[PDB]
Amino acid sequence: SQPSTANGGFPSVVVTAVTATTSISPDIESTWKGLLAGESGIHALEDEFVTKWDLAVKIGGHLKDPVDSHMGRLDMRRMSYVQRMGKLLGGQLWESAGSPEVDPDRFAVVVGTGLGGAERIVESYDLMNAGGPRKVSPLAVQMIMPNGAAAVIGLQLGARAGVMTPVSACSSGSEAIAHAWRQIVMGDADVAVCGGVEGPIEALPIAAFSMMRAMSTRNDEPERASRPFDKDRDGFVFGEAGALMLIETEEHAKARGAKPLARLLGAGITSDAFHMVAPAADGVRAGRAMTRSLELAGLSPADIDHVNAHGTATPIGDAAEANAIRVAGCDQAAVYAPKSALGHSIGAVGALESVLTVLTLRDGVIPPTLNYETPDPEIDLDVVAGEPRYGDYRYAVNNSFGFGGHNVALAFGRY
Amino acid sequence: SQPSTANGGFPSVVVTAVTATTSISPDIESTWKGLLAGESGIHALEDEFVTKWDLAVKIGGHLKDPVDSHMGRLDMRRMSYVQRMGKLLGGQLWESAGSPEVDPDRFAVVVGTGLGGAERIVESYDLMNAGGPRKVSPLAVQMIMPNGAAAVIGLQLGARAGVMTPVSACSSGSEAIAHAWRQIVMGDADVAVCGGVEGPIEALPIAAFSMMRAMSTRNDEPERASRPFDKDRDGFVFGEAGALMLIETEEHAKARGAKPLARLLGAGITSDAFHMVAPAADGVRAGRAMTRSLELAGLSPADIDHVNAHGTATPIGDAAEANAIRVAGCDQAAVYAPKSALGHSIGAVGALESVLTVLTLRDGVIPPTLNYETPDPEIDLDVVAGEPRYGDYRYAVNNSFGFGGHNVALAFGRY
Ligand SMILES: C=C/C(C)=C\[C@@]1(C)SC(=O)C(C(C)=O)=C1O
Numbered sequence: 070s071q072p073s074t075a076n077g078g079f080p081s082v083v084v085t086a087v088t089a090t091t092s093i094s095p096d097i098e099s100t101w102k103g104l105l106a107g108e109s110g111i112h113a114l115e116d117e118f119v120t121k122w123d124l125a126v127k128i129g130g131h132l133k134d135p136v137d138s139h140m141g142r143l144d145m146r147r148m149s150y151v152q153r154m155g156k157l158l159g160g161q162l163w164e165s166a167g168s169p170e171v172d173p174d175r176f177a178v179v180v181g182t183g184l185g186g187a188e189r190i191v192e193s194y195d196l197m198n199a200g201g202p203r204k205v206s207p208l209a210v211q212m213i214m215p216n217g218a219a220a221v222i223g224l225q226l227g228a229r230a231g232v233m234t235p236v237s238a239c240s241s242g243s244e245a246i247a248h249a250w251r252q253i254v255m256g257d258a259d260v261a262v263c264g265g266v267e268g269p270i271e272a273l274p275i276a277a278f279s280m281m282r283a284m285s286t287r288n289d290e291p292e293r294a295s296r297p298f299d300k301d302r303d304g305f306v307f308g309e310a311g312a313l314m315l316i317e318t319e320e321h322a323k324a325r326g327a328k329p330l331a332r333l334l335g336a337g338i339t340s341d342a343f344h345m346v347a348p349a350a351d352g353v354r355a356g357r358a359m360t361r362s363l364e365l366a367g368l369s370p371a372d373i374d375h376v377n378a379h380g381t382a383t384p385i386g387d388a389a390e391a392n393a394i395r396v397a398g399c400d401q402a403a404v405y406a407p408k409s410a411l412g413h414s415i416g417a418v419g420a421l422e423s424v425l426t427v428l429t430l431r432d433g434v435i436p437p438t439l440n441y442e443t444p445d446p447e448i449d450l451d452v453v454a455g456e457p458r459y460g461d462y463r464y465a466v467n468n469s470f471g472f473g474g475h476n477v478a479l480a481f482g483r484y
Numbered sequence: 485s486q487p488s489t490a491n492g493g494f495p496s497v498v499v500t501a502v503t504a505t506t507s508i509s510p511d512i513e514s515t516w517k518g519l520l521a522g523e524s525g526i527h528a529l530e531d532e533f534v535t536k537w538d539l540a541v542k543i544g545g546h547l548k549d550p551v552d553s554h555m556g557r558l559d560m561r562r563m564s565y566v567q568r569m570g571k572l573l574g575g576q577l578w579e580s581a582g583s584p585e586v587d588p589d590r591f592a593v594v595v596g597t598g599l600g601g602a603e604r605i606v607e608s609y610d611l612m613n614a615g616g617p618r619k620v621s622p623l624a625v626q627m628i629m630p631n632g633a634a635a636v637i638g639l640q641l642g643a644r645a646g647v648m649t650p651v652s653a654c655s656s657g658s659e660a661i662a663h664a665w666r667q668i669v670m671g672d673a674d675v676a677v678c679g680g681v682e683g684p685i686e687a688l689p690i691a692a693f694s695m696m697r698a699m700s701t702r703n704d705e706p707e708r709a710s711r712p713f714d715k716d717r718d719g720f721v722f723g724e725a726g727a728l729m730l731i732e733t734e735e736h737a738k739a740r741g742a743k744p745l746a747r748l749l750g751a752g753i754t755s756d757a758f759h760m761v762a763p764a765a766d767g768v769r770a771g772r773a774m775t776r777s778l779e780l781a782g783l784s785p786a787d788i789d790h791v792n793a794h795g796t797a798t799p800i801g802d803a804a805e806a807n808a809i810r811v812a813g814c815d816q817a818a819v820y821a822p823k824s825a826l827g828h829s830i831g832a833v834g835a836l837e838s839v840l841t842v843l844t845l846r847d848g849v850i851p852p853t854l855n856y857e858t859p860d861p862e863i864d865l866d867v868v869a870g871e872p873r874y875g876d877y878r879y880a881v882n883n884s885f886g887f888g889g890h891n892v893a894l895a896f897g898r899y
């Protein structure tokens with residue numbers, strides 16, 4: 070028999086703590102209460118660099134509580150922003166998990182980003198123009214690196230069973246959590262800290278994605294811009310975030326008296342080999358990843374109650390995902406596109422949305438997909454809209470796809 | 485029983501093709517013949533930016549055959565350098581594997597880098613200063629990304645079972661190959677293309693590593709600078725490279741009539757949680773990764789004949805590795821530090837050195853570690869030096885460690 074979670078071939082893995090900072094709240098429990106009240110993180114961009122560059126996009130959500138508010142001049146000298154966000158979230162996640170003393174040699178860290186410390190390279194380059202190679206920080210390598218954040222958290226928490234950084238543009242945060250899962254079921258660790266961090270809303274990425282025609286420009290009503298699955302959607306809206314979760318074996322969780330929030334049952338990674346930035350319209354490979362996660366969970370499509378959609382709000386993006394969900398045999402599920410309230414955060418967002426899936430399972434509730442007012446004839450999904458939807462959600466799949474054609478599906482269970 | 489390669493718990497995985505470009509040759513078979521004749525890739529740096537910045541480091545090895553010699557104005561417009569190197573090596577690796585038609589849905593790509601397309605971000609930033617957000621390429625995202633190269637190869641070769649990019653500074657190229665291995669033994673793929681690419685010798689990384697005191701400055705004799713394990717070593721020397729290998733199940737290899745070069749038996753990833761850039765002196769976690777690879781191979785330390793050392797040539801770097809190899813129970817093995825001839829290449833080097841391990845097993849030979857003239861009292865390793873050493877090499881472990889304290893060991897068998 071092929072090994073699976075449900076058949077006992079893989080060990081039971083549970084999520085036992087979660088932390089996130091978003092454009093609604095620095096607290097995750099508060100982000101959840103806000104979503105269920107239909108708040109939006111997205112507003113008009115105040116940043117003077119909008120009128121400076123005369124940008125087509127004039128909306129997005131900054132974190133409600135800026136990372137650097139929790140950062141002194143020391144932290145500022147040795148870390149990139151994404152490292153700074155890493156330290157913050159690590160610190161908080163441990164604190165919430167009752168600050169346990171684990172075995173360092175059974176402890177992994179997996180954290181993705183879209184980009185890592187890119188601000189720091191202009192910085193090191195400008196310093197060297199001004200005053201030479203000696204004006205460049207010894208420190209620079211380890212701010213500079215894309216494994217920077219994972220390194221910082223691993224060091225800070227004392228993780229000795231591997232510190233990994235997968236990168237896959239928009240799905241990095243889910244991929245991280247998949248690999249942490251792989252790392253645990255393969256015997257390599259008993260506990261893992263996983264997720265994604267990502268930097269703030271800057272001019273350049275706005276310009277780059279704008280030029281793709283990927284970005285909403287409904288500037289007249291910022292909260293109404295992000296319309297995943299809606300007939301009238303016009304692209305994605307940026308929304309700052311970072312999210313980590315603590316996953317451990319059920320044995321281990323039971324052993325230290327920690328009530329699980331949910332179970333992580335399986336994970337599927339596949340790729341499109343279609344196009345450098347656009348998803349395969351047929352949605353076959355993305356659907357395949359949904360299947361893989363079920364194969365490994367030990368589940369059939371009939372068990373999936375809820376799908377936390379990637380839902381970026383682009384015309385082709387959502388059409389593709391819709392096809393994928395059919396292909397996976399999952400269109401009879403209640404769908405949520407959190408990106409309609411929280412926007413899109415590249416490396417972090419997959420992780421944040423995995424946190425949301427877990428909360429959905431714990432609380433038996435799906436927040437409304439905001440701005441869902443006209444069903445797309447071509448989509449035909451059961452998209453949760455209007456108010457929150459309470460329901461008997463036993464199993465859920467979190468989708469995460471990213472430019473390059475990268476597909477990550479995480480299958481989760483109610484505990 | 486815990487699953488292992490040797491006990492049949494994991495499927496037999498073989499390396500069936502290899503390709504690399506290095507500072508000795510664009511051909512790998514030629515790099516191998518050159519090493520065994522004790523050639524060095526390292527020379528005086530001709531690049532005018534040395535006298536410009538008055539750099540302490542005036543040596544390193546550029547590729548013998550510049551990637552962009554194989555690149556036209558199209559390729560130059562849509563890809564970062566690391567993507568360009570990716571396309572080249574992918575193209576060649578397939579060609580050598582007899583250009584087989586595989587099942588796209590059983591086919592993965594795992595390729596690490598240290599940095600990815602960093603040149604491109606100054607480029608996009610400078611273009612936007614000159615002429616606005618509209619002067620920024622739609623294309624920019626997918627040059628910019630650190631998954632850029634893996635994406636390009638996956639697309640070019642048609643890999644539909646995942647395209648992954650691990651980053652862990654200096655060990656990315658080995659980590660990639662570990663995960664490709666994990667991807668295959670876990671049922672997710674039957675064949676995988678894996679390795680690492682990395683950009684050329686630039687001013688900034690020279691400055692950053694110089695400021696660490698990590699870099700040799702034996703400028704008077706460029707070929708004699710890189711002295712891994714030698715009493716007189718003074719740091720690492722840069723040496724450009726990129727390397728991929730094709731790994732598949734033995735079943736699959738047999739099925740298409742492809743003679744294997746070697747077997748990939750297992751892989752161990754662990755982390756130091758010691759320091760942001762320096763390795764743990766005790767070498768316990770690095771040694772642990774060596775052990776993990778043997779646990780999964782189904783081997784004992786007594787089976788390891790050859791260790792392809794990370795051997796960067798830094799005082800603390802090598803001392804640490806020496807401790808790790810004792811800890812793993814492997815100090816009775818013949819050791820090779822290819823970095824003494826080929827230098828260090830951050831994201832690529834782990835992959836190149838894994839290619840070298842495979843060739844060592846196929847050809848029953850270890851090239852001489854160059855510049856090994858005075859054994860360090862504190863090291864006590866059997867370092868191959870002087871001429872090549874022919875021997876009965878049944879199993880070998882390739883070590884790869886990187887800043888952040890990342891440890892990757894790959895265990896390989898003779899076929
Ligand atoms: C396989 C999926 C690919 C290549 C792209 C997606 C759907 S993911 C994403 O985040 C996004 C946008 C527009 O941001 C996409 O258009």
Ligand SMILES: C=C/C(C)=C\[C@@]1(C)SC(=O)C(C(C)=O)=C1O
Nearest residue numbers: 654761762763801885886887889
């Ligand atoms: C766990 C290993 C760490 C943190 C560092 C090493 C030994 S790896 C490497 O490539 C290197 C140098 C100086 O380049 C190191 O000093």
Ligand SMILES: [K+]
Nearest residue numbers: 377378379422
């Ligand atoms: K999602």
Ligand SMILES: [K+]
Nearest residue numbers: 792793794837
């Ligand atoms: K090595």
